[PDB]
Each structure stands twice: as C-alpha cells, then as structure tokens.
Amino acid sequence: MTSITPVTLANCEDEPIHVPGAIQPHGALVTLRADGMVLAASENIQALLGFVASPGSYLTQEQVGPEVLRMLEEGLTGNGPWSNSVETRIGEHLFDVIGHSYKEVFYLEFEIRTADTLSITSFTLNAQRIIAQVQLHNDTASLLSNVTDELRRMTGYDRVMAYRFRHDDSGEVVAESRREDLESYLGQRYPASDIPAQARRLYIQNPIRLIADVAYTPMRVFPALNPETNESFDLSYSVLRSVSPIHCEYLTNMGVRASMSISIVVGGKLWGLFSCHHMSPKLIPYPVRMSFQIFSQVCSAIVERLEQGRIAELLRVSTERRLALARRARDADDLFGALAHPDDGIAALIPCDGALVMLGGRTLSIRGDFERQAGNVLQRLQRDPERDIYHTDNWPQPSEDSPDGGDCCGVLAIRFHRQESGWIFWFRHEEVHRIRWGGKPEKLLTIGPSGPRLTPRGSFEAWEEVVRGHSTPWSETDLAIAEKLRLDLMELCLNHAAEVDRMRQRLIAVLGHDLRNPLQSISMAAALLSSSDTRTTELRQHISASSSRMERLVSQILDMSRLQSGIGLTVNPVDTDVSQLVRQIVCETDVAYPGLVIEIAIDPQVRAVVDPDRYAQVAANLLSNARHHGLPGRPVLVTLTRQGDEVCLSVLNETSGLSEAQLANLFEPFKRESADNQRNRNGLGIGLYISQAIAQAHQGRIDVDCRDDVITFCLRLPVRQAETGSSS
Template sequence: MSSSGVDLANCADEPIHIPGLIQPHGALLAFDHGGALRSWSANVPALLGFAPMLNQDVARLPLQAPVLAQLRECIDDSGAEGCTRTAVETTMAGQLFDCIVHSDAHRVIAEFELRDIRTETVATFALKAHTAIERLKRQKTVGTLLQLAVEQVRAITGFDRVMAYRFRHDDSGDVIGEALDASLQPFLGMRYPASDIPAQARRLYTINTLRLIADIGYTPVALVGAPGDPPLDMSHAVLRSVSPIHVEYLQNMGVAASMSVSIVVNGRLWGLLACHHMTSLRVPYSIRMACDVIAQVLAATVQSLDARQRATMVEQAADVRTHLIETLLQEDDVLAALARHAADLAATLGADALVFAQQGRVLVHGEMAHETATAVVASLPVDGEEVLQRCNRTEWPAAAHVPIGPWVGLLGLHFDPASGGWLLALRREQIETIRWAGKPEKLAVTGPLGHRLTPRGSFNEWVESVTDSAEPWDAGRLLVAEQLLAEMHRASMTRHAEMDRARMQLLAMLGHDLRDPLQSITMAATVLQHGAQPQQLGRRIERSSGRMQRLISQVLDMSRLDSGMGLALRHESTDISRLVEDLVDEARLAHPGTLYETAVASGVTAGVDPDRMAQVVSNLLSNARHHGTGGQPVLVTLRDDGETIAIEVRNHGAPIAPELESQLFNPFKRMALQNRANRTGMGLGLYIASNIVQGHRGSLTYGYEAPHVVFTVRLPAAESAP
C-alpha cells in the first residue's frame, strides 16, 4: 500500500464539502451577498421551470413572495457568520417544494427540495415528534434513552433500520440501540471502526447535524457557475452530493436510502443515529428537523446524565480525599496511611490494583505480585510530569514490557518528588472480544474509481481479540486524580514542614543536653590538671562522653532516616497571586474566628518552589493569628514593582521586644520557648521560613508600623532555578 501512496490519509483528504454536485431530488441557487446569482444546479430549468442567468438579481427571479422574502432577509443579514437557516413551503412548475435558505461568509444558498407528502401529514408527524421528546426527557440511563430514540425516529420517518451508536475514545462506535424491520439482520452490540467516518466527515457531522441520502443509486447533478469562482462550500447544504466511497459503502450494506442525525455533546461528536432503508425514501425537511430536535434533546439529556454522574463521583472522591489527608497528617508512615485507604482509592480512581512507593519501599493493594510492582516502580521516570499515563504496552520502556505482565494501564501520581513518593493506579489489559460489523480494514484495489482504498464489502459479524491495551482514564477520573494529587502535595508540604521543625527541635534539645556533659568533662579536666584522683574523674569523663556519643548517634540516625528531605528547592513557574489567595482561603476555613483582609495583585508569577513558598506564607499567617490582638484582622498584601515581589503579612499587636527581635530568625530562642503562644512548638518556624526565602535569593524582614507587626518577604521578580 505504501508503494502506491494509497492509505487512510487519501480517504481523509477527500474534499467532500465541495463536491460541485447535488442530489437530483432538488435544485440549488447560490447568490453573492449583494443578491446576484453566481451559480446554480443544472436541473433548475427542468425542476423550477425557468432558465437562470449569471449575475441575475434575486428580485428578477420568478420565485414566490415567501421565498423572495426569505432570500432578501438572509442576504441582508448575511456576513462572516452567515444567517440562520430557514425553510418555507413553495410551489414551482406545478410541484411542491421545501425551500431551505442559509448562508456562509461567501454565498447565500437556496435549496428547493421536492416533497411528495401533504402538509397535513407532515404536521401529524411533527406532533408525534413532540410526544417523543417529552418521553426522552424522562429517561434515566443512556441505554434506555438511545433505545427509545431509535424507536421514535423509526416511527416518525419510516426507515427500515435505525441504529444509535456511541463513539468510544478511539472514535470507533458501539451500536447500543436499534429498531429494525423483522426481516433484517440485527447489528445491536456490534462495533463500527473509526475508519468508517474519516476526519473530514466527522467535522461535517458536527457542524451539519442531519444528512439525508434519498436514493443511493442517484445520478448527481452538476453545479453551473461563474468561471473562476471558488468551489461552492456545501458544508451546510441539505442536497450536497455524497462521496462515491460512501455510496459504495452503503451499496455494500444493501442500503438504498440513509439518514444520519448527529448527537453532539460539548462540541464533540458523541454519537450518531444512523437510519437505513432498503428502497429509496424521501423524508420531508420538517420531519427531518423534528428528528434533529430529538437529537438535540438526546445531547442535552446525555450531558445532564453525564454531569450528574460526574458530580456524584467527584463528591464521593472528595469524601475519600478528606479522610485520606486527615490520616496522612496524623500518621508517621505515609505508605501505611495510603494502604489504610487503598480500597476507597482504588474505587475512586477506577483501578484494578494500587502500588505505593516512597524512598525505596513498595506496598501493593490488589492481585498484583510484589515483583511486578517493583518492575512498575523501576520503570518510572526520575523527573517529568506529576501525572503519568500509560494505556498500551508500547508506551512502557522496553525493559518493562515482559515484567509488567497484564498490567499495561498506569495512572501515576508523583505526590512527593523529594522522597520518590508515587501513588500508582494500575489497570489490566482488556483481553476483549470485539464483534465488528464486518472486518474493519479497508483494501487498496483498482476499480471504477481508480486505485484507492475501498470500503468494506462485508458486514457480517467479524470477531477480533484485542490485547496489550487497557481502557484509558476518562476526563472525570483524571479530574479526581488531579484533585487528589493537589491535596497530597499539600499534605506532603505540611509533613516536610513538621519534619524540618522536628529536626530543629532535636538540634535545640541536643544543644541543651550537650551542655551538661561538656561542662562535666571540662571541670574534670581542670581538676586533673591540679593533681586530683584520676580514677573517679575518669569515670565521670567516660559517663559524660558516653552521653554525648549517644546524643550524637541519635542525631546521625535521624539524619539517615531524614535523608533527602531537607530544604531542597524545586523551582518552577508559579502563580504567586493564586498561591497567596489559596492559602488565605484555607486559613479562613480552618480558623473562622480570625478575620483576614487581602490586597493581592493579580497575575504575579515567579520561578519558585511553590510548596516551600506556601510554607513561608502559612507560617507568617499562623504567627499573625497566634500573636495578633483578638478581634483585629490579619492584613495580607502582594505587590510586584517589576523587579521585586513583596508579600506582606500584618497583625494588630505590640512591637516585639528588642532582646527577642535580635534573635527573631535564630533557631534557638529561649524567650520563644517561654512564650505561651508557642506552647505547641519551639519558635523554629521563622528560622525555617528565613532559610527558604534566602534559598530563593530573597529576604524575610520584621518591622513595626503602629499598631501593626509587619513581616515582609521580598523575592526577585525574575527568580529562577540556580
């Protein structure tokens, strides 16, 4: 196929929106925006009874007054966006037509479609459609909704078969609703490949949601137009001729007439109502529009059902997330905390198994071997995106293809990069038996249309087994995962802050506890110099040095446990405005008794470590809350003067005593330990915050502007990773 240059791209490149042809059960006139006739179908004289002339003004055409009025209105309203499509009944050359008028950026088009059903009969069908719409609105599931829709559309239009199929993530479509004549073979439950609807056809299905082919064996009618004019864009035309490949496709199915009605949800082709008839069938325009309204009601109902389902899922996920974060903040062992909520997390993320990894440890939830979980963790990138997705074995590193076994679907949440913390949701491959409506591949052959891809010739059931692929995570699950990741990031940030604080407390205690043994050793050494008894003093020195050794060993042990969790900074472009606003909002929720007032400049960004900067701001907010005068607001401002970003936190209170001010940013503050406001800590927060800010080439300063205590963080506006 590659040698001939014939592939699916050729099929996708077919310019089906400008065929230059129409179906013969109607005639077409195309005007410029000034009302001059620029092109028409060759059958206008035979069908409409007059001979058109190039540049003939619309007012001079022998058209009935309602048609002329619609055309004039559309010409007056036409522009870049075009006028709204309208339809009016008219009689031309003794025949009844529906005249459909519409426009685009270049032309105003009038299509005259023959109608052989009386107006009274059409009105009856429209009433049936209204009843169908009311029933559709009451459906509670997508399956019952589409099944009712195909039954109602078949009753209204008279087609032999009406199918409803829903598109999957790969654009193939499953038939999940069908109403048909008893003599036909059912297609319910079968799948149509994505290649049945090329990209440009999918585009037309989205912008022109209803398409009728009244007689598949028709002879197309050519358009006549001004030489040199660009081809007429017929994307919105109801008479547009059909691609010869599509004609052959329908003929292979034994179909003589067809109609398709698009189900468009959120601007995307979600599904399709496909109507087939074994003989030619013309469905009047107004009845087709009733079917189009049914499809719009379908789309709105599907969107409503989907939104309701997603809201339920998000609500349940929020509950799981809340309980998980509470456990993470209380539990010393992060992996143990995750394992405690593993079943709920697996249900929330739609996973068959979960793997938790951090600092070389791996825990598994589900029917996955530990060796497989280890291979999965080994395949993860050291750096990269925080949310990692893999849905096919080929997306994994080659070395992992065999060790991962059937676990080819991965959704990885890198919740703590500093410690290699991952939450991994795994899905098994779908060993799926697909009932295709015919073998999906197209073949390149030479035929009446030249050497090209031909549509499928058989639509008998063709079964295929699919392996090495897992169902991808949908948008709803990904939203839940991103929300979970954000909360876990915050929990990790809090844990790191607590561990930093604990390390500083340990150092403070170490410094205090080392004084006594050091003093004993010094005194013993002094006494020895004056010739005292060495045996007793030696035992004192031994005891004191042993105590020192134990204290230092404890520090070294903690250092080993705490490896890699220091003040390492991960610089990234961060919305400082959003960060400050979010933290103030959190403080408001957590401490409703404290009033916060903000003056935060919008759109302030810088290259910083967002978690560490959040730690700084949180500490300043906490200090302001603890030390501020009750009933007075905490004031938070953010400014950007182009070179420096300033974050300022003010609280109403007395100035800090001069003797404490000089030690304010030191880790060991005796007065801080005596302060009742610090009864839950040792006053180490400002020391840590100052180090974080200095790591960003900035400064953290204290000032007093009566009656306010003011702490100010200043950062270079263009700060980036060293």
C-alpha cells in the same frame, strides 16, 4: 510566522466534503450574491423549475414567483444569520424552497414534494411528539432505546440505530429498531475511519443529513468557483449537498438505498448519531427534517445533562472516600502505614486487583505481591524521570523464560514525593475482551487507473476479534481520582516533611548555645597555664590554637544557621580604624603564614563606622581564600583605600584559572569543587557566602574580577556615621 507548512497526518481526513461543487439531483440549487445577483446554479434548473438561471441576472417573478421573491428579499436585506423556507408551486410541481446564507453567499434550494399530501404533518407536531418522548427518560440507555423506536415509527425507515462514539473515536451500535427480515447490527463496533474527523466536525455544525438515493448521479453546480472570490461555494449548510462518493460506496456495500442521520452533540464533540437506513429510495419532506433538526438539539442537551449527572455523582462518591482517606492519613502516625492497610486505604479508592505504596524505600503490597511489577515499572520510568503519572492497559506480558513474570497487564502509578520516591501503584489482571466488529477491518487500499483508492470494506459480516493481554482500561474517572490523590498526598507530605526543618532548627540552636561554654572554659584554662616548661608552653599553644579553631567553626555554624533561617547578622556599626585593623590582620597573617608573601597598599588612618569583628572576619575569609586558591609562592597584594563615600579593599592573587561558572558559584556554599581541591579539602566554602552576607548587612558589596587567571576581589562598604541620642 514559523516559516513552515506542516503535512497532514492521515489521508482519510483530507477530502473537502463541504465544497463538492455538486448537489443531489432530487432538487435544484441557485447561488445568489448579497445584492441578489445570480452567481451559479445547478445544471438541472431548466428541467426541474422550467427556467434558466443565467448568472449575472436577477430572479424574475415569472421564474420563482412572489413567495420566493418575498423570502429572498427578506433574506438579503435582513441582518444576522438567515434561514427560511417557503412552499410554492413552480410549473406544476409543489416545491419546498429552502433559503440560507453562509459566508456572504445566499442559496435557494428547491425540493420537489410531488405525490405527497400537502401539510400532511407539520414541523411543530412532529417536534412536540419527539421532544415529549425524549424528556421521559432518566437514563441514556433507555433514552436512546425509545428514541430509536419512535424515530422508526415516524419515518418508517427499514432500520434506525443509535450509534455511540468511543474514547478512541470508534463507535458501537448501542440501540436499534429494524424490520424483522433484516439482520441486527446491535452491539457491533465500527472503526474510527468510518466517520472521518472532517465529517464529525461538519456534523457538529449541520446536524441533519439525508441521502434520498444512494445510487444518485451528482448534479454539478457551475461555475464551480465563486466569481467574487474564485473560491468554491461552501455548501456546509446546504441540504442538497452531494455526499462523498466514498460514503455512497460504503452504503452500496451495505445494500442501503436511502440514508438519514441526526447528530448528538455533547460537550462540543460529536457524541453519537441516529442513523436510519432504507432499502429503497426515500425522501423525508423538509418540514419533518426541520422537526428532526430541532429534536437533535433538544436530545443533545438532555443527553449532556444525563451524562454530566452520572459523572458528577461518581466524582462525588469518590471524593468522599478520598477525603476520608486524607483525614485518616493526616491523623495517623505513619502515612506509609495509613495508606498500606488492606481495608480501606488506597486500594479501595480505585477498582484494582492489588496496589502498592512506596516511599523512602519502604514498600507494602495490598491484595497481592507486586514489588517485582512495581520495580520493573520504575526501571521503565527511569527513562522519563520527569513523568509524574503513568497509566497503561497493555503492559508487555512476560516471556516464558521465567515464571517470575507477573500478568498484571494494567498499571496506574502516581508520584506524590519525587525526592523520597513516594509512589502509589494500582494493578489490574488481564481481562479477555471479545469485540464484534461490523466486518473484518481490511485495509482501505485498491489499485486501479486512479492509483490507490481509499475503498471501504467490501463486506459487513460480523467478525469477532478476541483481545488478549489487555486489562480493564482506566477510566477518565479513575485517572482524575489518581491525580487528585497525588495532589492531596503531596500536600500532606509537604506538611509532614516540613517538620524536619523545625527539629533541625531547635537542635542546632541548642547545640550552638551549649557548646560555647566548654570551649570558653578550655580556652581560659589554656590562657591560665603558667607556661613555665617548654613542653607546657608547646602544649598550651597547641590547645589554644585548637580551641580557637573550634570556636571559629562553631561561629561559622551559628552564622550559617542564622543566614539560612533569615534572621541575618546583627551588626553593630562603630567608628573603627580600618587602617589599623587591616594592617594588624595582614601582619598576623604573614607571621602565621611566613610562606605567604603579602603585599599591602593600605591607606593610613582610614576610619569608618563598621563592625570590627565582622570586618576582621571578612579579611580573614579573604586571606584564607587567597591562600587556598592562590598559586603557590605567588604574592598577594592587599590594597585598602577610601573612594569617597565607600571604603574599597582589594586583594589580587594569581590562580590556576577560574572558569566563569566557578566565578558565578564562588559565593555558593559547600561547593563540591572545594572537596577535590587538595589545598581546600577542609574548606566548607561558606567563606564567600558569609562574607557576602556580612557585606549586605553593612549595606556594602563584594566585587570580583578574575582576568588572565588572576582574580581580584574588591569589598565596597558605605561610609556612615553612628547616630547619637539626645534629650533635645
């Protein structure tokens, strides 16, 4: 739907190995339609089976015999997936005829069992042999060790190996059984490109491969495209499927002449393989490969059980320490203390060569001194501040320019208090690794008539690569522990930091209560001054003005605290003459500010049940806002009107132009722009915030209209009558 077609990232995953259009010549293939019509067949069918499977026809009993027709008939007419096989003699050779269905196409694959003993061993006896062996092991090390030997005994292959994939898709030969005169491949690494993603995905679906003769010439199955869809025949589940010519080249470079492999699937991912080699052609009869296909799933389930148990036990053991630390830190007076102890603490949660706890600008290093390393990592994290977890095993080793460089190649950092910079770091020193590679990893490129070819390595001689500047990698367990600790510490930091709010509530509330009395006393004393002398009169006036200003500030503080605390404003609606109140406020404002030209259009005797103190407060806030933000010398128009069940008071004044962002933030508290406005340098900006809260408390609202740098405010309050109680 995005109208885009991405391009693949790697050319090694782009071979369609599942639709080769060819089979290995040790059998014959026939493809059949859901009604039984022959669609395509392998070109050797006349030589191997003695008859021509002409497309469009149906198999005759003279051709495949009654056993194959009985099997096919039960297949085509059956329901759900189909997979069956039967033993029959066609011509003079005994054949294993395998049948399966995939994506509505039915396949019949014939393998010769010439020069072999009839029913020498059955699928059930071999399956029980292996499953009984596999179930004796409680560790994957010994499970893979013994299974590799039993598989070599049963098959008789020149070599059998257990190959385990790494987290980076590479893999290592973790177990081996081999003929004495063969060089051991145990413990060698092989790169991720040796088994491409396409194969790993396929080998989760079809657990068994066999290559009977690595020198084989593919037999083309023609027509190559299914006539009913023009699509290639999907041979994913075919046993005769022609393997990639690049892998037969890879095995020719190993000197291998037959191959077999069995998948190990864990968690829906290809966990490993059992790979078998022979230095001469070798075919394993289908009943035995069927027993191996059964074993593949039993062994996969057992390995999964073992790995899940081991991981679960490590997770439990670590959860114990994490919870104990959480308890200690919760009980301790200082978290930055309880975590920063060289005994236990966070340094003991994850294997590290030292750790550092950082919070609120306080740091402590455990088992070393890493404030330098930590600070430098933060100076790296400053480029991606939204990142909360950082882990690395290849920290750039410092240059020789100064000995201040720290060789702590491993860093694992987690942020538990983003605003206070709560950081925990775990460090690891450089661990010098040595890797035995199965052949030098030369590039997959050769140029010839085909252009560049993805040719495999020319030799598999064990090459030893020394790794420097790398530490012990942080396991998925360590990363999980680090994240769970991050969350546990965030929760504790929130519970800890939330107490600051309660303290400020108590403090401010007591201050608001205790400060009113001295101000009231001063205002009363100023009112009691006889004002006999002109000097005494001026001082009395200045004292009364300053006291009223402080009372106003204290009132604003109380209101803001009550609003932020959610208590709201306790309004007392009473029948108030809005006309008289607004006219009085305007007159007092004009007399107080003779330079402020105030125009009034106040309807007479507008009476409404409203709180006179809150309405006066709103009017004062609006006049102050118009004075501070209005253009100097411009007149202010005040219009009070009753619009049905609402009282509308409008104030219009010119401005130097207000942006839409400023208009949206007009009601925001502590607006930074107020500190820069030379006329409002002392304005807290809460005037609109408090006014809006007052309007909401009165079930009203404050409208704002700014046009052509002229802003118009319209207070709308609902008309209501106060309730009166009676005994009736």
